[PDB]
Design an enzyme around this catalytic site. Structure first.
Site, PDB file in Angstrom:
ATOM      1  N   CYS A 215      25.090  -0.381 -10.897  1.00 55.95           N
ATOM      2  CA  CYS A 215      24.200  -1.525 -11.036  1.00 55.95           C
ATOM      3  C   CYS A 215      24.979  -2.538 -11.862  1.00 55.95           C
ATOM      4  O   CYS A 215      26.161  -2.762 -11.570  1.00 55.95           O
ATOM      5  CB  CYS A 215      22.853  -1.122 -11.650  1.00 55.95           C
ATOM      6  SG  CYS A 215      22.916   0.025 -13.076  1.00 55.95           S
ATOM      7  N   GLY A 218      25.622   0.254 -14.947  1.00 59.04           N
ATOM      8  CA  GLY A 218      25.878   1.591 -14.443  1.00 59.04           C
ATOM      9  C   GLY A 218      25.175   2.701 -15.198  1.00 59.04           C
ATOM     10  O   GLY A 218      25.665   3.840 -15.196  1.00 59.04           O
ATOM     11  N   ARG A 221      19.321   1.561 -13.621  1.00 59.91           N
ATOM     12  CA  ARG A 221      18.990   1.802 -12.222  1.00 59.91           C
ATOM     13  C   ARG A 221      19.859   2.915 -11.640  1.00 59.91           C
ATOM     14  O   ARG A 221      19.364   3.781 -10.905  1.00 59.91           O
ATOM     15  CB  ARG A 221      19.146   0.504 -11.429  1.00 59.91           C
ATOM     16  CG  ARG A 221      18.017  -0.491 -11.723  1.00 59.91           C
ATOM     17  CD  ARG A 221      18.347  -1.899 -11.220  1.00 59.91           C
ATOM     18  NE  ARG A 221      19.369  -2.554 -12.037  1.00 59.91           N
ATOM     19  CZ  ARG A 221      19.782  -3.810 -11.853  1.00 59.91           C
ATOM     20  NH1 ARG A 221      19.259  -4.553 -10.878  1.00 59.91           N
ATOM     21  NH2 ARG A 221      20.720  -4.320 -12.638  1.00 59.91           N
TER      22      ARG A 221
END
EC number: 3.1.3.48
Length: 298
Positions: A215, A218, A221
């Site tokens: 994302c 990281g 999400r």
């Protein structure tokens, strides 16, 4: 079942924030010395998101092997993921070098390039067939082959070529475009429809390298995606929903990268996704079609 029982108790007690903070307090703390070296400052997008030394992905270069990326190796589930930040303008070549060297088949992108008025990720893949990208620093070429655009996600077929050897590989790029930073998907159905699209592609198969998930940082999400996938895989091996301890799985994942799952509501959503996904695992194959309808992907 036990998972459903705990969910109802936490929802009734309104204690998601407290449960989530307990996870943060118990989470592993390992050194990130390489990430914090001065020469790597411009390879990190966020000052407070770094890979642990013990699990970081090393680039196969003699100059500088550092990338902000972690190998999440889930021993009991027998699945591995690479979680990484959204590539920076100077690390797009490193990103594709990692995809090549780790033999990944799929890239899962859970953010947009622009979110909340700011640039959260470089445009690291080509958007037009006739405008391929060449990464001179890592000697790779990347071409868009085709794209399947749905209402809230897009799947792209890419060709990655090692310009040194002329070998080529198909990379599948799964782009979820409606999941807000520090937020949750519209529904369990929309998330699960997307997750099983990734699964059906073979990108999570053990005959390939680990899927790359990112994302912007990281962890948020990206952590939600991998937690749900791993929990559903564990349930599949035993056909036993009560044998999966979601908080224990998350704490195991956090041994490999800090900060996975960024909000209490993302943790709550992870329970929802796993509880709903259990319907398919436990033998109701028709629910996959229901998710597709409820996701309004068409």
């Amino acid at each position: 079942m036990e998972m459903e029982k705990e969910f109802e108790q936490i929802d009734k007690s309104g204690s998601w924030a407290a449960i989530y903070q307990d996870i943060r307090h118990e989470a592993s703390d390992f050194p990130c010395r390489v990430a914090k070296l001065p020469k790597n400052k411009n390879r990190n997008r966020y000052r407070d998101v770094s890979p642990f030394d013990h699990s970081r992905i090393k680039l196969h270069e003699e100059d500088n092997d550092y990338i902000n990326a972690s190998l999440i190796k889930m021993e009991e589930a027998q699945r591995s993921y690479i979680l990484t930040q959204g590539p920076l303008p100077n690390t797009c070549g490193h990103f594709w070098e990692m995809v090549w060297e780790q033999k990944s088949r799929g890239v899962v992108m859970l953010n947009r390039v622009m979110e909340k008025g700011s640039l959260k990720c470089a445009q690291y893949w080509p958007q037009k067939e006739e405008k391929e990208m060449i990464f001179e620093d890592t000697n790779l070429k990347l071409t868009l082959i085709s794209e399947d655009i749905k209402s809230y996600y897009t799947v792209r077929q890419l060709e990655l070529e090692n310009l040194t050897t002329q070998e080529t590989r198909e990379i599948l790029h799964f782009h979820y475009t409606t999941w807000p930073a520090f937020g949750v998907p519209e529904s369990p159905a929309s998330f699960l429809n997307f997750l099983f699209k990734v699964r059906e592609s073979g990108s999570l198969s053990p005959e390939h390298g680990p899927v790359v998930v990112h994302c912007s940082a990281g962890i948020g999400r990206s952590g939600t995606f991998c937690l749900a996938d791993t929990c559903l895989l564990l349930m599949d091996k035993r056909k036993d929903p009560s044998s999966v301890d979601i908080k224990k799985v998350l704490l195991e994942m956090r041994k490999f990268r800090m900060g996975l799952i960024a909000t209490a509501d993302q943790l709550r959503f992870s329970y929802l996704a796993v509880i709903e996904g259990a319907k398919f695992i436990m033998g109701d194959s028709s629910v996959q079609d229901q998710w597709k309808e409820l996701s309004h992907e068409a």
